[PDB]
Structure formats: C-alpha cells, structure tokens
Amino acid sequence: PTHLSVDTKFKTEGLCVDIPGIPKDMTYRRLISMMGFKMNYQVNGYPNMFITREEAIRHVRAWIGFDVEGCHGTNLPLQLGFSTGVNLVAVPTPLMYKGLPWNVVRIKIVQMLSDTLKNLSDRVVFVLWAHGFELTSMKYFVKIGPERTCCLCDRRATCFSTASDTYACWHHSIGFDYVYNPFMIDVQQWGFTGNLQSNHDLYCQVHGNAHVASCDAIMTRCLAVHECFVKRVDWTIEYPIIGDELKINAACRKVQHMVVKAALLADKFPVLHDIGNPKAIKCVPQADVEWKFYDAQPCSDKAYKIEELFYSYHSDKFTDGVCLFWNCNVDRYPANSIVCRFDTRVLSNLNLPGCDGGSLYVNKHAFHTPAFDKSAFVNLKQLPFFYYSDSPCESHGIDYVPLKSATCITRCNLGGAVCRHHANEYRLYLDAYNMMISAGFSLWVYKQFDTYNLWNTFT
Ligand SMILES: CC(=O)Nc1ccc(Oc2ncccn2)cc1
Ligand SMILES: [Zn+2]
Ligand SMILES: [Zn+2]
Ligand SMILES: [Zn+2]
Numbered sequence: 001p002t003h004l005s006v007d008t009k010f011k012t013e014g015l016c017v018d019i020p021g022i023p024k025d026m027t028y029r030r031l032i033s034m035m036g037f038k039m040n041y042q043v044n045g046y047p048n049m050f051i052t053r054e055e056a057i058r059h060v061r062a063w064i065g066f067d068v069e070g071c072h073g074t075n076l077p078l079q080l081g082f083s084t085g086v087n088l089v090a091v092p093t094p095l096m097y098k099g100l101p102w103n104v105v106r107i108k109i110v111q112m113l114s115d116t117l118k119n120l121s122d123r124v125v126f127v128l129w130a131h132g133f134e135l136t137s138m139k140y141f142v143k144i145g146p147e148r149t150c151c152l153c154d155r156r157a158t159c160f161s162t163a164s165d166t167y168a169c170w171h172h173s174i175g176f177d178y179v180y181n182p183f184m185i186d187v188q189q190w191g192f193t194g195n196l197q198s199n200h201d202l203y204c205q206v207h208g209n210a211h212v213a214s215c216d217a218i219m220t221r222c223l224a225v226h227e228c229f230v231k232r233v234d235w236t237i238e239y240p241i242i243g244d245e246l247k248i249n250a251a252c253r254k255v256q257h258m259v260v261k262a263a264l265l266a267d268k269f270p271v272l273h274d275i276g277n278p279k280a281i282k283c284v285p286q287a288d289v290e291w292k293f294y295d296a297q298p299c300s301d302k303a304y305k306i307e308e309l310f311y312s313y314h315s316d317k318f319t320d321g322v323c324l325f326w327n328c329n330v331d332r333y334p335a336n337s338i339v340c341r342f343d344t345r346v347l348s349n350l351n352l353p354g355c356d357g358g359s360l361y362v363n364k365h366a367f368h369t370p371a372f373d374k375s376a377f378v379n380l381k382q383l384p385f386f387y388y389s390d391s392p393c394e395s396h397g398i399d400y401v402p403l404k405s406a407t408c409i410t411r412c413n414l415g416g417a418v419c420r421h422h423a424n425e426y427r428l429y430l431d432a433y434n435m436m437i438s439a440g441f442s443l444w445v446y447k448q449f450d451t452y453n454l455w456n457t458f459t
Contacts, residue, residue: 004028004052006039014188018070018132036139045147046181051125056185057228058237060366061352062121064113065221066184067213068133071099078137080105081213083127083221083353084116090140094214103177106141110159110176118170119242119349122156126184129196129220143178157181187224199223203230204356226355229368230301238364243349245363248439251432256283256326256340258429259443262388262409263322263338264289266453267446271321275309276328289321296328300358300368303329303376310334322446329370335379339444344372346440361440372442383443385433386451387426390458393419403427409451411458 006029012022023030028050032039037049056063065083070076077099080088088108089099097108113124128134148157148167155169159176168176192199197209200219203226207218261284264272271290274280278295292315296304309330310318323337333339344351344359352360357371388409403423405413410426412419418426437443 001052003047003055004050006032006048010050010186011189014130014186015132015135018136031135035135037142037144039144042146044145046144049144049182049184051183051185053185053190053228055183056125056127056224057234057366058239059121059123059125059183060225060228060360061239061242061362062117062123062125062183063127063221063224063352064116064124065217065219065224066126066128066134067216067220068137069213069216070133073133073136078133079213080109080137081215081217082112083214083217084112085214085218086112087212087214090137094210094212096212102140106177106179107175109141110173110179113179114159114170114173114176117158121242122169123158124179124182126182127217127221127224128184128186128188129216129223130186130188141179142182143180145181147181185224187220187227190227196220196223206357222353222355225352225360225368229360229366230355230358233300233368235365237366239362239366244435244439245350247432247435248350248363251436251439252340252441253283254429254432255436255443258388259383259445260284260324260338261287262386262451262454263445263449265388265457266450267322267448269321271315273315273318273321273323275323275325277326280326283324283326290315298327298367299329299370301370303331303370303373306330306332306334330376331373332376332378333380333444336446337380337444338383338446339377339380341372341376341442341444342369343440343442344369348438348440351440377444379447380444381447381449383445383449384451385430386454387429388451388454389422389425391421391425393421395420398424400424407451409454414455414458 007027010026010028010031012026016022028048032049067081069079071079075092078090085094087096088105090102090105091099093101143160150157150169150172151166152172157167157180158170159168159173160178160180161176196219200223204222207222209215264287273292275294276296282291323334325337325339327340350363354360354368358369361367361369386407386409393412400420403418403426408418408426410422412422
C-alpha cells in the first residue's frame with residue numbers, strides 16, 4: 001500500500017451542496033472521471049490524482065491550500081483562492097484580482113505555483129476542504145498523463161504548454177499554461193464534525209475568516225498541518241536536502257560549543273543543567289563542570305511551562321549554576337540561562353507557515369515550532385557575536401588580509417596582532433554564525449555574561 005487505491009471509497013456528503021444528487025457510494029476512480037479526467041489504465045507513475053495522509057506528510061513542502069467559491073454553475077464566475085493569499089476570479093465568458101477568462105487565469109496559476117514551489121518541492125499537493133466547485137474547476141487548468149521529465153532539465157514535469165506541446169519543471173515553466181500531474185488531498189475525508197472554520201478555530205487564532213476563498217485555503221492547509229505535525233508527530237520521516245541544511249546544522253553545533261565553552265570559562269559555574277533532547281551529548285566535553293541532563297522532546301504545540309519542567313519535585317536546584325536550553329522552547333526562561341530559540345517569523349525555504357503563529361521548520365526532519373514570543377526572554381539579553389580560542393597560534397598548511405577585530409578573543413589579539421590561524425578560524429566562525437542567525441535562530445544569555453572576563457584565561 002504505497003499509493004492510494006483508486007477503488008478506495010470517497011465520502012461525498014461534503015460535496016452535495018455544490019453537487020446535489022451526488023451518489024453516496026463513490027470511489028476515487030468514479031470521482032476522477034466525474035472531474036472530467038481519463039486515466040486509461042495507465043502504469044506510468046501516476047496511479048491516482050489523490051494521495052494518502054502518509055504520502056501528503058512526506059511531501060509537506062508541496063502543500064498548497066486551495067478553495068473555490070461561487071461568486072454569485074456553467075456561466076457562474078468562480079473565485080479561486082490559494083494558501084499563498086492569492087484570489088483569482090475566473091469568468092466563463094489577501095490580493096483580489098478582477099474576473100478574467102480561464103485561458104489567462106491558467107497562465108497566472110502556473111506562474112504562481114512555479115514561483116512558490118521551485119525551491120521547495122518537485123510537485124504540488126492541493127490541500128482541500130472539498131465541497132464541489134474546486135474539484136470541478138480542475139479540468140480548466142490541469143492536464144494529466146504519464147510521469148514525464150522537464151524539456152530543459154532532469155527534474156519531473158509539473159507544467160505543460162499547449163503553445164509548444166512541451167513539459168517543464170517549476171524552474172523552466174515561464175509561459176506555460178497547464179499544471180501537469182498535480183496531487184491533492186481532501187481533509188474532509190479524515191473524519192470531522194462541523195465545518196472548516198469550527199475545526200480550524202479550535203487550534204488557531206491567527207487565521208481569520210474574511211469570507212474569501214484564500215482565507216478558506218489558508219485555514220484548510222493550517223488545519224492539515226495541525227493534524228499531521230502538531231497533534232501527531234513523526235520524527236522518523238526524512239526530507240530531501242533543498243538548501244543550506246548541512247551548513248546550518250554544522251554551524252549550530254559550532255556556535256553551541258563556542259557559547260557554552262565561553263560561559264563556563266567567564267563565570268565558572270559549578271553545575272550546568274542541560275534541558276532538552278534526550279539524545280544530547282555534552283557540547284563541551286573537556287569542561288570541569290558537573291553536567292546534568294534533563295529530557296524534553298521538542299514541543300510542537302505550545303511552549304513548555306517552566307513551572308512543569310522544573311517544579312513538582314535532578315539537582316532540584318536549577319537556580320544553582322547555569323541552565324542550557326538549546327532549542328528547548330519554554331514560556332519564560334530563568335535568569336541563569338544560555339538559550340538558542342528558533343524565530344518562527346523567519347522567511348526561508350526551510351521554514352513553512354504553521355499553526356497558531358507557529359512555523360514548520362523542515363531540515364532533515366519536520367518540526368512544528370510554537371510561535372516566537374519576545375516575552376520568553378525578559379530575564380535575559382541578546383548574546384552578542386564573539387569568537388574565543390585558547391588553541392596555539394600556529395598556521396600549519398586561502399590568501400590573507402590582516403584581521404583587526406575587538407571580538408577576536410585570542411592570545412594573539414591580547415598581544416596586539418591576530419595571527420593567520422586565528423584570523424582564518426575567526427572568519428570561518430563568523431560565516432557559520434551568520435548562517436545560523438539568518439536561518440532563524442536567536443541567541444540569548446544571562447545578563448552578567450561579559451566577554452571581558454575571557455581575556456584573563458590567557459595568563
Ligand atoms: C536531535 C535533534 O535534532 N534535536 C532537536 C531537534 C529539533 C529541535 O527543535 C527545533 N525547533 C526548531 C528549529 C530547530 N530545532 C530541538 C532538538
Ligand atoms: Zn526543468
Ligand atoms: Zn490557522
Ligand atoms: Zn593566534
């Protein structure tokens with residue numbers, strides 16, 4: 001059972017207001033035919049337009065919410081809404097566009113999907129709360145057939161052009177007019193009571209209902225993200241590399257070792273409380289400190305309440321030494337903390353919009369992250385950039401312009417002239433640091449943290 005069988009039953013009750021008289025007994029096979037598409041008994045990689053919840057989860061980067069509303073069928077204008085916030089009006093003669101015939105609407109659809117998805121996925125997954133008009137509008141902008149490759153590259157085809165009779169991926173589809181072999185999933189098939197707004201509003205206050213198709217499209221995709229990544233979490237699913245994943249993860253480890261190593265040297269805490277991932281390793285293995293670990297998996301719904309993580313009876317005295325929260329999201333960090341908190345508002349190809357202000361950060365695995373909250377950091381301050389090193393000043397082994405920086409905390413800089421080795425390492429560290437920050441990570445530290453305390457470790 002890799003794919004969804006076309007002979008699987010589809011509950012049609014949600015469809016009967018737009019499609020009155022629709023049979024109760026319905027399969028995907030019959031529904032696809034009713035949508036005006038012909039499958040022709042084809043064993044060519046596209047067995048069904050519809051996919052399973054498990055196939056949808058593996059392809060979350062392709063999710064595009066889609067809703068169609070009657071503007072007043074046949075000669076009835078339709079408002080096509082997408083979770084990108086776009087509303088297009090198709091005539092059969094929060095951005096709102098005036099009514100235009102399908103021949104030009106389809107060009108806009110292909111441009112919009114290609115720009116949204118080219119750096120995210122090899123396909124499109126239309127996320128629906130199906131009532132009828134969305135399924136019946138598909139024939140006007142969608143073509144299907146065997147799985148194909150792009151005319152200009154090796155990627156799978158996502159678009160077709162009637163002008164040239166050719167196929168293209170999201171990167172080479174300029175001027176293309178048809179969406180080719182898209183996928184779709186109907187959230188109503190999952191078993192819900194009541195309408196879309198009543199199910200969406202149970203878990204989210206950020207998306208409102210301005211009574212337009214894009215609002216419904218956004219709510220549908222949000223509800224799907226909540227069901228698949230908030231109330232149900234699967235960290236075994238692997239996602240492909242689409243950007244700077246490897247560099248970001250390597251930078252995260254480098255910055256963690258740097259910041260924790262310097263905090264221990266500058267303030268000499270006798271104990272460190274490491275709160276978070278149950279598979280955590282000591283990030284500063286040579287430190288003298290009593291290292292104590294506390295298990296907490298990544299919170300995907302609301303940030304952990306500090307009172308539940310720490311109280312209800314471990315050193316028990318979390319107030320002793322320092323607390324390390326490396327991507328362990330809490331409502332209010334204690335004053336004696338070293339913190340790395342992912343900022344959900346960051347715009348990137350790894351960060352997808354999520355539920356109730358949260359975001360879906362997809363880097364090797366998918367992590368729904370609760371909304372970034374500035375009040376969580378009131379007992380702390382932003383951690384400034386700095387580079388520290390106690391390693392010998394020795395080159396061993398890329399040209400050189402002399403480094404001058406007040407934040408290069410090394411013996412050579414204390415001595416008045418940064419050596420080549422420490423200048424190379426500083427610049428590499430700065431690149432890693434900027435990579436991590438730009439990926440959305442934010443760093444916070446206890447107010448007494450002062451890098452001036454690091455210079456005296458060079459005696
Ligand atoms: C072993 C491991 O990978 N641990 C882990 C993963 C994700 C974590 O939350 C998170 N949230 C947003 C951005 C990044 N990370 C926390 C810890
Ligand atoms: Zn291509
Ligand atoms: Zn929402
Ligand atoms: Zn040096």
